[PDB]
């Protein structure tokens, strides 16, 4: 029946954590990090977190290279699922980065704050997996701090989310009075203490509720009537679809709701799914190696595999120079515990050390074949400056610099119509910061920023050439090209763009263009 591969390849799990800031992401990860036995990586994730806030020593050493990298793709066992879950920067260095993670993950899962509900990064992110019809599992966390109610919180996900919630687990109180979870399916009681096998309960009647509830037992027996009317259950295909979302109550501090959660990934969490390609749809389940770049560093470029078997002495051919290259001493992202020939697995991360000459989407095979991955787009940034440089005789220089960055992706580059400016787009601010610094070490050029009326952009097209030209004509004033030749409509906010819009129904304005 099944090959060595295709039964590898569907072990597989691979998601990355869509969250809103300081909803407990770090702290979640290194809960299911033991639970894969991860013992160091979830070292790693704690000692990193510790840093931040520590003295002046550590925060120089976690804003290093080398463990920024290590725990940027962490993968451990479970249930012997081989789970890769990807970090995805927040906080100070969310970036592209991060929506690109989201370019490489078979599924998502959400992480919500109980007290804070839905967020701004949470809304955003979870824009991201909707376009591209990921799979998403909610966690709903720290219900040992007052919270939402859990209806109120579902509400909130509905909403803002776009998405049916289907609770697995609900919580009886919050706070001071958080007794614990139900888990509505497997009909078990998960009392929190100061983890441990959970408790059978028999019908809502059962007096056992009583007994480990207290009076709080009508609150729960009071919420599962209504929720077992105005109920979604978990449906495996409707979940596929994007259409539902399976949610979790816990309290990732203490280690509590986790588990439940984790298995319900590991069981209905999907494996490697085909990817498109210009020619064909590639399936995980060919022996012939494919990979495709969706982040890069500065140089390795981290790529995701998309169907065959990746190991050391093998010879991979990169598609957009022609050329050939040696991953002779890559980096395959793996278990602590190695015990087997080094191999990986489509649905892995593997990084190939490749200087410059590289691009995001890039494509990798084995055979002699064309192909070319599709999909991984750029994304609408959020923050716009305009570069002004020092000395005009070093303008050839930025040229260089800038066009370069943005070949590799550090940053988005749009020139206006109107003039010989250019207008940096950054996904997260931080990313303004970088450029600077590097066009320095790498380019010989101090550059300095000024601030735009710009706050939005739009990649427009359209089919009617003669409403397309008169467009063109009018926003004369509002237009730019990218870095990758693709006519851009900046506004200075969202608002001011619908009055644009309006005014030419027949322009699409979209949020994302593909890669070349
Ligand atoms: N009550 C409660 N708190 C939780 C829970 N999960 C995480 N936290 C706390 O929330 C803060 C953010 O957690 P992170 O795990 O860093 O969140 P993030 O990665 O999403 O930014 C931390 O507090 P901090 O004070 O900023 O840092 P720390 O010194 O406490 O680690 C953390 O201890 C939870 O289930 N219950």
């Not at 040992?144 to 009886?172: F, G, K, N, S, Y």
């Not at 959660?261 to 490697?272: H, I």
Request: glycine share 8%; with cysteine; net charge negative.
């Amino acid at each position: 029946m099944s090959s060595r591969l295709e039964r590898e390849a569907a072990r597989r799990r691979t998601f990355a954590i869509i969250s809103h800031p300081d909803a407990g992401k770090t702290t979640l990860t290194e809960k299911l990090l033991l639970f894969g036995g991860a013992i160091q990586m979830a070292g790693s994730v704690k000692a990193r977190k510790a840093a931040r806030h520590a003295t002046s020593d550590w925060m120089a050493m976690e804003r290093e290279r080398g463990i920024s990298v290590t725990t940027s793709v962490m993968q451990f066992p479970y249930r012997d699922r081989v789970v890769n879950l990807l970090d995805t920067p927040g906080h100070q260095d969310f970036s592209e980065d991060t929506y690109r993670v989201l370019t490489a993950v078979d599924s998502a899962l959400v992480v919500i704050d109980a007290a804070k509900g839905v967020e701004a990064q949470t809304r955003k992110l979870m824009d991201v997996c909707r376009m591209r019809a990921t799979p998403v599992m909610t966690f709903v966390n720290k219900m040992d701090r007052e919270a939402l109610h859990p209806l109120d919180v579902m509400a909130d996900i509905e909403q803002h989310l776009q998405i049916e919630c289907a609770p697995m687990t609900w919580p009886i109180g919050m706070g001071s009075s958080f007794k614990g979870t139900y888990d509505l399916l497997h009909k078990q009681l998960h009392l929190f203490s100061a983890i441990q096998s959970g408790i059978v309960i028999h019908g809502a009647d059962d007096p056992q509720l009583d007994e480990y509830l207290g009076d709080q037992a009508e609150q729960l027996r009071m919420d599962l009537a209504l929720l077992e009317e105005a109920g979604t259950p978990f449906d495996e295909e409707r979940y596929l679809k994007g259409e539902l979302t399976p949610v979790f109550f816990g309290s990732a501090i203490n280690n509590f709701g986790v588990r439940e959660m984790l298995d319900m990934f590991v069981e209905f969490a999907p494996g490697p799914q085909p990817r498109p390609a210009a020619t064909r749809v590639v399936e995980p389940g060919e022996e012939a190696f494919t990979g495709v770049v969706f982040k890069i560093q500065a140089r390795m470029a981290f790529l995701r595999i998309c169907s065959g078997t990746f190991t050391r002495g093998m010879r991979l051919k990169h598609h957009r120079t022609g050329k050939d290259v040696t991953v002779a001493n890559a980096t395959i992202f793996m278990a602590q515990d190695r015990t087997g020939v080094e191999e990986a697995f489509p649905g892995d991360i593997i990084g190939i050390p490749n200087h410059g000459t590289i691009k995001i989407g890039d494509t990798f095979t084995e055979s002699k074949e064309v192909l070319k991955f599709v999909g991984i787009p750029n994304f609408a940034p959020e923050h716009f400056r305009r570069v002004r440089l020092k000395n005009p005789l070093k303008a050839k220089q930025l040229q260089k610099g800038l066009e370069q960055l943005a070949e590799e992706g550090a940053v988005q580059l749009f020139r206006p119509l109107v003039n010989n400016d250019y207008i940096l787009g950054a996904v997260g601010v931080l990313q303004f910061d970088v450029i600077v610094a590097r066009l320095a070490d790498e380019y010989g050029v101090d550059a300095v920023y000024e601030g735009v009326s710009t706050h939005t952009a739009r990649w427009v097209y359209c089919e009617d050439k003669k409403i397309f030209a008169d467009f063109q004509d009018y926003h004369r004033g509002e237009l730019a090209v990218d870095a990758e030749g693709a006519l851009a409509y900046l506004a200075p906010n969202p608002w001011r763009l619908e009055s644009a819009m309006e005014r030419y129904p027949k322009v699409e304005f979209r949020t994302t263009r593909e890669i070349s």
